[PDB]
Scaffold this active site. Structure first.
Site, PDB file in Angstrom:
ATOM      1  N   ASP A 169     -15.608   3.562 -10.797  1.00  0.00           N
ATOM      2  CA  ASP A 169     -14.822   4.048  -9.671  1.00  0.00           C
ATOM      3  C   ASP A 169     -14.930   5.580  -9.643  1.00  0.00           C
ATOM      4  O   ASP A 169     -14.454   6.268 -10.544  1.00  0.00           O
ATOM      5  CB  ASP A 169     -13.354   3.646  -9.826  1.00  0.00           C
ATOM      6  CG  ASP A 169     -12.591   3.703  -8.512  1.00  0.00           C
ATOM      7  OD1 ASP A 169     -12.828   4.636  -7.716  1.00  0.00           O
ATOM      8  OD2 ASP A 169     -11.749   2.811  -8.282  1.00  0.00           O
TER       9      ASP A 169
ATOM     10  N   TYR B 268       0.920  -1.129   0.000  1.00  0.00           N
ATOM     11  CA  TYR B 268       0.000   0.000   0.000  1.00  0.00           C
ATOM     12  C   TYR B 268       0.963   1.182   0.000  1.00  0.00           C
ATOM     13  O   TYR B 268       1.122   1.873  -1.006  1.00  0.00           O
ATOM     14  CB  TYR B 268      -0.863   0.033   1.260  1.00  0.00           C
ATOM     15  CG  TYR B 268      -1.817   1.200   1.243  1.00  0.00           C
ATOM     16  CD1 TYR B 268      -2.876   1.245   0.336  1.00  0.00           C
ATOM     17  CD2 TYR B 268      -1.615   2.302   2.076  1.00  0.00           C
ATOM     18  CE1 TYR B 268      -3.707   2.359   0.254  1.00  0.00           C
ATOM     19  CE2 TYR B 268      -2.443   3.423   2.002  1.00  0.00           C
ATOM     20  CZ  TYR B 268      -3.486   3.445   1.087  1.00  0.00           C
ATOM     21  OH  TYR B 268      -4.296   4.556   0.994  1.00  0.00           O
TER      22      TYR B 268
ATOM     23  N   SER C 264      -5.334   0.711  -5.131  1.00  0.00           N
ATOM     24  CA  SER C 264      -5.351   2.157  -5.002  1.00  0.00           C
ATOM     25  C   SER C 264      -3.903   2.700  -4.855  1.00  0.00           C
ATOM     26  O   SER C 264      -3.089   2.410  -5.950  1.00  0.00           O
ATOM     27  CB  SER C 264      -6.236   2.538  -3.828  1.00  0.00           C
ATOM     28  OG  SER C 264      -6.317   3.929  -3.840  1.00  0.00           O
ATOM     29  N   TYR C 265      -3.486   3.289  -3.735  1.00  0.00           N
ATOM     30  CA  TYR C 265      -2.106   3.756  -3.593  1.00  0.00           C
ATOM     31  C   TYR C 265      -1.162   2.562  -3.756  1.00  0.00           C
ATOM     32  O   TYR C 265      -0.043   2.705  -4.252  1.00  0.00           O
ATOM     33  CB  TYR C 265      -1.879   4.398  -2.217  1.00  0.00           C
ATOM     34  CG  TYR C 265      -0.670   5.309  -2.175  1.00  0.00           C
ATOM     35  CD1 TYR C 265       0.630   4.796  -2.243  1.00  0.00           C
ATOM     36  CD2 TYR C 265      -0.828   6.691  -2.147  1.00  0.00           C
ATOM     37  CE1 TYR C 265       1.743   5.650  -2.295  1.00  0.00           C
ATOM     38  CE2 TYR C 265       0.266   7.547  -2.198  1.00  0.00           C
ATOM     39  CZ  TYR C 265       1.545   7.024  -2.275  1.00  0.00           C
ATOM     40  OH  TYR C 265       2.608   7.890  -2.360  1.00  0.00           O
TER      41      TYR C 265
ATOM     42  N   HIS D 213     -14.652   1.775  -6.492  1.00  0.00           N
ATOM     43  CA  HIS D 213     -13.337   1.564  -5.909  1.00  0.00           C
ATOM     44  C   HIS D 213     -13.183   0.292  -5.093  1.00  0.00           C
ATOM     45  O   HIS D 213     -12.099  -0.288  -5.037  1.00  0.00           O
ATOM     46  CB  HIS D 213     -12.941   2.763  -5.047  1.00  0.00           C
ATOM     47  CG  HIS D 213     -11.489   2.785  -4.703  1.00  0.00           C
ATOM     48  ND1 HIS D 213     -10.505   2.806  -5.666  1.00  0.00           N
ATOM     49  CD2 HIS D 213     -10.851   2.743  -3.510  1.00  0.00           C
ATOM     50  CE1 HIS D 213      -9.321   2.774  -5.082  1.00  0.00           C
ATOM     51  NE2 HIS D 213      -9.503   2.735  -3.775  1.00  0.00           N
TER      52      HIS D 213
END
Ligand SMILES: *C(N)[C@@H]1CCCN1C(=O)[C@@H]1CC[C@H](COc2ccc(C(=O)O)cc2C(C)(C)C)N1
Lengths: 726, 726
Positions: free
Chosen positions: A670, A509, A592-593, A702
């Protein structure tokens, strides 16, 4: 011998974790839900009684997904027709049931499609938002008073946050705050008139002939942000013949000079409220403490009670300035702020004193202030054992900061190193919630002598179940990098044999202030990979990680996509030299990240990884929202940080993907990390002649959390990992 | 020994086919382009001369992508700043170069972003469309006369087709027709005011922060269609002080009663124009023959000169009613219409006679009428050898239909069985274009005695090249199904050994009136599969196929997704029992309609196919345009064909995909078969728990033809095939 934790066990949830979600209704009792009915418990002895039978609503006609009992115990809010919007927002229908007369209130009922509802803190008053306007209901069966009249979908939000404020600052749809005894109702108002709209197609059910276009006010990095206004209305002044008068609380002047945000609101007393503002450049924040003027009916925020909080190394707060915890009289408060040494600790303030005094210190940090009595301050910290990934409840004597006591450390050292807590109204009792390394354990205690009253839930059921399966173990430890030590964790296959060489998957992450290396017990995809496929799943917290001080956390300031990804590569490089790691089979994945970092890593050219998977990844910071991006990247202008904004994209690394196997995945609906981000990655890969695997999830957002999509993505990812390793 | 036709040879076009694109400027001369300059040729002797040197435009400043010499030879139209829109439409900039004074006309130049330009048929008049309005330029350097004033983007189209008329009926952006000597300019006008809009995201270059939404008037099955009006203006009446008067040609009354289309316009003489209309139910069509009234200035369409063309078994025409070919005086014409026996042949009409006389007959069909002299009618047919997949030029004596001569059959039987032709202005000369089974061969002939004048191009260069490579062979043949014989073709690997068992890939399209089994020579992906991977690539023409009569073609009327897909499965079933086919390795793929069939097949549950690939497939007919869909499916209403519309979707077959490996691919900017179609397929597969491979192509349209995307999709598909077979 016997079975292992299979993919199907994860997707079908065959091994469930028992919880014990209680809700304190006073300083002595708490409510305890159940799939059928709600019971009321006595903390002191543990005896209970049914509050409302599971049959009271058999022929209600609708499926109730949630209840909310008024502080009076006199009413119950029934929520149904639940329609999810973003991560926190949603609309629903509501009905109020009178417990004193056991009747369903049929007059002046709360409208359908209500955006937010909340009882007052003490009686049974109600405040709700509908069509972006605020309404107050003094009595459940009486007509509602409309507080605001400027609401307008996608434009003016009264009492509710717009998209970015919901996701990035308040982590809630609600933008209204009742005063302690319910007299005043404070609220924010957002104006998105000039905020650009993100547009994307929504296909809907097969029956829809023409795809619809969803558009939502979403400020991307550097774009026009929404503006905000704050108000406070006296709910004891409502008429029905006159429009309610809302007193506005403006400024600060040091904030009005440019773009800014409202980042925190906390009532101090019945007539004192504190507000925290933040400049668009999240470098400097100001706290106002405004008192109600009995004779003017206005709210004065005396410059003198203003407290400035700024940072020279980065942004303010972990994700925003921390909230204050006032003393009963409201003349002083405690709040976590960064040290002179860069570590976040509790500082004691006098509402009128410019310099605060720290009451805790050391190379560790206070995670949060949990409770405050005139006698003690209770807080959670990762001090114990110097483990950044552990959490424990401590209490400090307000009269002698030298006397601090750990309330959770020794309860069960082996099984519990990660605690969260829930105090009663006056902190007379507290429920400790242990979530690892062993199975979750819930217990009750009394604050007078911190005595353990009893175990509420010990997951004995799941325990007997898991001993019939070859479960994986979790290794928490660290490695050193340039004098500094960084922690990592590894989900080790059962019967781990350091002689053998295992394929390794790096779960990442690594966004600012993140922590993937902790003592929490989890039953997830990683559990299956280690238990069934004998794959080691590791996670590393490098530069940018949180709860270890600003020197580590602020290391990626204005420089996202650099050190956090480098350290990830470096951690894997060290892992591949450990003896039980097949350096020819090392993968990396994230969401995501984590999808961003995974991509940046695979396109680094390090050759350390064979394959990788990125789910809903950010590809270039100019595509993400302003509040988040700018907090770490500044403005994407030449005079500011445009150069690094352009140097940290995934597409610029497109050419280097020739050396790896890449799986790109994204939900087409998303609203957070727009499909656009992956669309640009795939296009940059095509333009360079790089082959890769892809998968879009139509209409998923998402979370890619629908029951079917969830099982499908993990199933699809498992095939990819198995193939890359076997 | 030596090399084979590799994937890279296909993607990089290492083996190119030479062409000989000429353009007749008269009955004796033709122009011949070249990468540098343009030459003029004398058909009789073959001698040439440079028309304009390759240097005339060295410092023009722009990259010219096309030229257009006025019928006078007096001017040259220069096209640049080319911006492609749909399959035929595009905008560009234009400059006119005077050849008499060798100067570039700088006054009253044609505006930028011109949608369509065309010289008149004889002189040097110009008609062009800009901002949806028509303009006429009598002289290249003189001001333009605005003919129309109602143009409005996405609403009113004057002189140009809207999306569906461009794609489904005229196969052109142009909607204007000059009279034979340039006196009159006829044009259509389309009104899309109430036509629904298809909306989809366009990401554009990385620099675009917010994705844009493209919307285009696109009528899906059963939706509101665009309306049409027809006009004729006299270009010899333009003033500059008065607005041009356009005479409208309305009706027919049998068409005005409901929804209809303008499907063909053909001038008969200097003052006679024919128009063909079609009801929304493409069952019935009417032809009007309108004469100019010298004294009224109006255009009268005498009911008596109206010819009705309808069908009881299906729709009218192969894709629309065929065009008429009038006799010099315009009192009679020839046109291909379906037989009493269902076969399309040439019927001779008297503009005032209700019954026409067929002049050709038999169990074969006339592909098209190519040229008409007062002496002979030249046409292309698949009569020779009874091969539906072959094409030959024939000529029939208008005074004795019993005297028909094949002009191409015996030229080179071995090498040439597929011809197209290009006659000069008066049909004094003709160029035959052989495209298979051997290498393309271009030759010139004179009509007086059909003598062969010379070879223009024989591809001798490529021939020497291909003998150094292990090329595949092509087997054309048939199989019998219920008395009827259906043709198929197979690209056989080099050194084909009927003893060995080869994996087979079924290349399918199979839309109504299609033909995938012919004698054409091709250098494509299939060539690589057979030459390098030793894969047999077959194609089959079953029910629904064209050029074999209405009994086969109309077999899928109002019933798409049934017999054409069944026959495909059946053909493969017979192939798998041929001895040289490994029935354990049979795949199927297609594009657009071929993508639909491929999906329907894979979801049939036949178990005959191991894997399949669908590129931009239709998934449910309610998602495709009205003009096409309705022609074969009728209206999606309960009173009509809604039931079959709903029975023929791909998603309803979702569950059966568990038995196969599926690769779904689609361009996100497909304006033709909307991404929506594949979005619904993938969603239906997820909802049923079926795993599959996917790939989206951001910003690519139906062709997925950009240089990089093209190579990327074929590369991606090759890996999938190789894996499914090895
Ligand atoms: C993916 N992870 C994307 C790409 C980088 C930024 N991304 C975000 O989603 C950011 C990170 C922080 C914020 C989401 O914050 C939260 C979500 C949920 C909760 C919760 O309590 O349930 C809390 C937060 C905070 C407190 C804001 C961190 N958007």
């Amino acid at each position: 011998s016997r079975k292992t934790y299979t993919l199907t066990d994860y997707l079908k949830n065959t091994y469930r974790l028992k919880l014990y979600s209680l809700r304190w209704i006073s300083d002595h009792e708490y409510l305890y839900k159940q799939e059928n009915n709600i019971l009321v418990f006595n903390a002191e002895y543990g005896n209970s009684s049914v509050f409302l039978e599971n049959s009271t609503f058999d022929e209600f006609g609708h499926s109730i997904n949630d209840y909310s009992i008024s502080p009076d115990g006199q009413f119950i809010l029934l929520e149904y027709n639940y329609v999810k919007q973003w991560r926190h927002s949603y609309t629903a229908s509501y009905d109020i049931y009178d417990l004193n007369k056991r009747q369903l209130i049929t007059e002046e009922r709360i409208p359908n499609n209500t955006q937010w509802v909340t009882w007052s803190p003490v009686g049974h008053k109600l405040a709700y938002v509908w069509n972006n306007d605020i309404y107050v209901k003094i009595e459940p069966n009486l007509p509602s008073y409309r507080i605001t009249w400027t609401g307008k979908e996608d434009i003016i939000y009264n009492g509710i946050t717009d998209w970015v404020y919901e996701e990035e600052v308040f982590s809630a749809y609600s933008a209204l705050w009742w005063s302690p005894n319910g007299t005043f109702l404070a609220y924010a108002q957002f104006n998105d008139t000039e905020v650009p709209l993100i547009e994307y197609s929504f296909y809907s059910d097969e029956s829809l002939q023409y795809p619809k276009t969803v558009r939502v006010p979403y400020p991307k990095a550097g774009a026009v942000n929404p503006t905000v206004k704050f108000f406070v209305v006296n709910t004891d002044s409502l008429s029905s013949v006159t429009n309610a008068t809302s007193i506005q609380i403006t400024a600060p002047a040091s904030m009005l000079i440019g773009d800014h945000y409202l980042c925190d609101v906390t009532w101090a007393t019945q007539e004192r409220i504190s507000l925290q503002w933040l400049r668009r450049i999240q470098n400097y924040s100001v706290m106002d403490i405004c008192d109600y003027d009995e004779s003017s009916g206005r709210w004065n925020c005396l410059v003198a009670r203003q407290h400035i909080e700024m940072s020279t190394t980065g942004w303010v707060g972990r994700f925003r300035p921390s909230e204050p915890h006032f003393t009963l009289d409201g003349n002083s408060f405690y709040k976590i702020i960064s040290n002179e040494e860069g570590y976040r600790h509790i500082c004691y303030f006098q509402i009128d004193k410019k310099d605060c005094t720290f009451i805790t210190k050391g190379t560790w940090e206070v995670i949060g202030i949990e409770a405050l009595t005139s006698d003690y301050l209770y807080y959670i910290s990762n001090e114990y054992k110097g483990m950044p990934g552990g959490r424990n409840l401590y209490k400090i004597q307000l009269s002698d900061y030298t006397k601090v006591t750990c309330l959770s450390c020794e309860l069960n050292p082996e099984r519990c190193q990660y605690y969260s807590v829930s105090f009663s109204k006056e902190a007379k009792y507290y429920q400790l919630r242990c979530s690892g390394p062993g199975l979750p354990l819930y217990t009750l205690h009394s604050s007078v002598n911190d005595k353990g009253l009893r175990v509420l839930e010990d997951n004995s059921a799941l325990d007997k179940m898991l001993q019939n399966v070859q479960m994986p173990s979790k290794k928490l430890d660290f490695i050193i990098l340039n004098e500094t030590k960084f922690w990592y964790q590894m989900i080790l296959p059962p019967h781990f044999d350091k002689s053998k060489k295992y394929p390794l998957l790096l779960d990442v992450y690594a966004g600012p202030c993140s922590q993937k290396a902790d003592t929490v017990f989890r039953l997830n995809w990683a559990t299956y990979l280690a238990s069934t496929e004998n794959i080691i799943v590791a996670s590393f917290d490098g530069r940018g990680s949180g709860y270890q001080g600003d020197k580590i956390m602020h290391a990626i300031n204005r420089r996202l996509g650099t050190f956090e990804v480098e350290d990830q590569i470096e951690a894997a490089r060290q892992f591949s030299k450990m003896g039980f790691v097949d350096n020819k089979r090392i993968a990396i994945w994230g969401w995501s990240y984590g999808g961003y970092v995974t991509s940046m890593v695979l396109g680094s050219g390090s050759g350390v990884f064979k394959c990788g998977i990125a789910v809903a990844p950010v590809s270039r910071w100019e595509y993400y929202d302003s509040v988040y991006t700018e907090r770490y990247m500044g403005l994407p202008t030449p005079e500011d940080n445009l150069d690094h904004y352009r140097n940290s994209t995934v597409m610029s690394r497109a050419e280097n993907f020739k050396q790896v196997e890449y799986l790109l995945i994204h939900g087409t609906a998303d609203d957070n990390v727009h499909f656009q981000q992956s669309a640009q990655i795939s296009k940059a890969l095509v333009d360079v002649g790089v082959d890769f695997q892809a998968m879009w999830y139509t209409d998923e957002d998402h979370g890619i959390a629908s029951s079917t999509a969830h099982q499908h993505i993990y199933t699809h990812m498992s095939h990819f990992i198995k193939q890359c390793f076997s």
